[PDB]
Every structure is written in structure tokens, then in C-alpha cells.
Design a protein around this ligand. Structure first.
Ligand SMILES: N#C/C(=C\c1ccc(O)c([N+](=O)[O-])c1)C(=O)Nc1nnc(Br)s1
Length: 328
């Protein structure tokens, strides 16, 4: 069978936390007053919720209301419990309230409002300094949730809110987040295609926080190289091929061999043989201002097939890539 894997950090966080911390199914939602919030405008719709700008009329503060679509009590309470567990952590979106929506017959999560800069505008305008700064801010959030026994499992630009005016960043949409329990097999149908780690694409279920670092590397690659998304697979199979055309097939085989994973035989006539490439080949005159030796080495250390070999969030924050970023 497949060789087991454990996280190299924060392995036992949920073991030594009380059961109530990770046993989200037993969590008792403390409900607020649904009439406290008047919806102002629909901000977006996902697979699992609709998101509204709202005013909390009790404090006259803008908030954001995420009305969940119907899905099972555990997945709702999973997100709720995780948000409550992480509340107050660096750059974690703050769950302010939970109300019962009377129309959807579902929970509505109330969050702090982040005046988020247009995502298109941000990718087009972020400087080298800004990318490092915000990467560091994301790493704070990721190290925090990882240190709290939680993997986000959906790290992607759309889940990173940035109020660029205040240089404020929030990691949002914890609806896919899970508690990391050593030895637990997880759903590999997480993350958006372009940010799925190799572990997901080869159906290796015993993954951990390091999944988020792959996704984070995909974001970093897309930013410094100005290629959105960086690994642009047409489906989950082509996604792995796109990755193998950069990281090479020999290390992909090393990876699946280490974990006694077998590729889907459908890869046999689409995968091919690929050398590992040097990151410099993605540098060109339109992205070179965003590229440095530090950027490439940092990216190189995030985008490993082997989830056990990627930088942890904490190690990532040690990287010389961030030496230039002003520390508060
Ligand atoms: N989407 C969104 C927003 C917040 C949010 C918070 C937690 C959360 O879990 C989710 N989620 O799941 O999609 C979303 C938001 O605040 N969007 C805005 N767009 N313009 C302005 Br101004 S705010």
C-alpha cells in the first residue's frame, strides 16, 4: 500500500489540544441576532456560499456576510469551529458573528469587512516589494493556522483579501480548511485546480499543512513571473503534466516511489519524459523586475513534489527573500 506520511511540524497540535478544539461536530453554535445585519450588496457567489456586503446596524460598522449554501452540519461547523479557533490570529479573517438566515435556512457567517482592492488590479500593480511583503503576510496566516492544527487547503489569490491602502491582508474562505490529524486520510478534491499540490493530483490522501505551501508557491510563481495561473492545466491530469514539465518527471517518480504511489495509468500517454527546468527560463523582460535569486530560490523550495520537502511556513519566513521586507 501507500507509505504513510506525517507533517514534519505541528504534528501533534490537535492531540494535545482538548477534544472540543478539533471535534467540530460537537461544537455548539452560539447564534447572534440575524436582524443586526442589513445586506447592502451581493459581493459574490461560490460553490458553497453567497457573500454580501452588509452593515452591522448595532455598531454602524461595515461587515461581510457569507450565507452558506445547504451542505452538511459537520462541514458548516468545521468552518465555524476553525474560524473561532483561529480568530485573532495574524491575518486570519475575523469571524464576528453567526446568525441563522431565515430565507436560506442556513448559517450566515459575519466577518470583518476588508476593503479589498480589485484582484486584477492588484496582480497587475504589485511591485517586487509588495509581493514579498504580502507573501510574508500570507505566511503569518499560514504558520498561524498550521501551528493551530489547521490546514487551509484552498490557498489561492481569490482567498487572499488585500486592502492595499492599509497594507492589510486577510486569508479568507476557511470552508475547505481541515484539522490536521497525523495519519488521517483526507479528501484530495480540495483546492482549485491550478493550486492543487502533487499529493492531490496523485491521489495521496495522507497530506498535511505542506499542501498550503505548494498552493502558496503556485501563487508566488504566478506573481513573480506574471503568468496567471502558473501551472495552467486543463484538468487535474494535465495539471500534473504541466507541473512535471517544470519540476521534471524523474523527481515525480522519486516522489510517488517514496510514498509507493502509482500514477493513474491514463498518464502513460500524456505524461512523457521531462527534465527538471531552471526557474530562470520563466524570467523575461516583462517580469524580471519581480525576479531575484532570492525569489527563485524561495519558489524552488516551495514547489517540491515531496510535500515533506517543502519549506514550512515558518521556514519560508526565514528565507532571504524577505530580508528586504520591513519587519514591524
Ligand atoms: N468574497 C469575499 C469577502 C469576504 C469573505 C470573508 C470570509 C470568507 O470565508 C469569504 N468567502 O468564503 O468567500 C469571503 C469580501 O469581503 N469581498 C469584498 N469585495 N469588495 C469588498 Br470592499 S469586500
Amino acid at each position: 500500500g501507500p507509505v504513510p506520511s506525517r507533517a514534519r511540524v505541528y504534528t501533534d497540535v490537535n492531540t494535545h489540544r482538548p477534544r472540543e478544539y478539533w471535534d467540530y461536530e460537537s461544537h455548539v453554535v452560539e447564534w447572534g441576532n440575524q436582524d443586526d445585519y442589513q445586506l447592502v450588496r451581493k459581493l459574490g457567489r461560490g460553490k458553497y456560499s453567497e457573500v454580501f456586503e452588509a452593515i452591522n446596524i448595532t455598531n454602524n460598522e461595515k461587515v461581510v456576510v457569507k450565507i452558506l449554501k445547504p451542505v452538511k452540519k459537520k462541514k458548516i461547523k468545521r468552518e465555524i469551529k476553525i474560524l473561532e479557533n483561529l480568530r485573532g490570529g495574524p491575518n486570519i479573517i475575523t469571524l464576528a458573528d453567526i446568525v441563522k438566515d431565515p430565507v436560506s435556512r442556513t448559517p450566515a457567517l459575519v466577518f470583518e469587512h476588508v476593503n479589498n482592492t480589485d484582484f486584477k488590479q492588484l496582480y497587475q500593480t504589485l511591485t517586487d516589494y509588495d509581493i514579498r511583503f504580502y507573501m510574508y503576510e500570507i505566511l503569518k496566516a499560514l504558520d498561524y493556522c498550521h501551528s493551530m492544527g489547521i490546514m487551509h487547503r484552498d490557498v489561492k489569490p481569490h482567498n487572499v483579501m488585500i486592502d492595499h491602502e492599509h497594507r492589510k491582508l486577510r486569508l479568507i474562505d476557511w470552508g475547505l480548511a481541515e484539522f490536521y490529524h497525523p495519519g488521517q486520510e483526507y479528501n484530495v478534491r480540495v483546492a482549485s485546480r491550478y493550486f492543487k499540490g502533487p499529493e492531490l493530483l496523485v491521489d495521496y490522501q495522507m497530506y498535511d499543512y505542506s499542501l498550503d505551501m505548494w498552493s502558496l508557491g503556485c501563487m508566488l510563481a504566478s506573481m513573480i513571473f506574471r503568468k496567471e495561473p502558473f501551472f495552467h492545466g486543463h484538468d487535474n491530469y494535465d495539471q500534473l503534466v504541466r507541473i512535471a514539465k517544470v519540476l521534471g518527471t524523474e523527481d515525480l517518480y522519486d516522489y510517488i516511489d517514496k510514498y509507493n504511489i502509482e500514477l493513474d495509468p491514463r498518464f502513460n500517454d500524456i505524461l512523457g519524459r521531462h527534465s527538471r527546468k531552471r526557474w530562470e527560463r520563466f524570467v523575461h523582460s516583462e517580469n524580471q523586475h519581480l525576479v531575484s535569486p532570492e525569489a527563485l530560490d524561495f519558489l524552488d523550495k516551495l514547489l517540491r513534489y515531496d510535500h515533506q520537502s517543502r519549506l514550512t511556513a515558518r521556514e519560508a519566513m526565514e528565507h532571504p527573500y524577505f530580508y528586504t521586507v520591513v519587519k514591524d
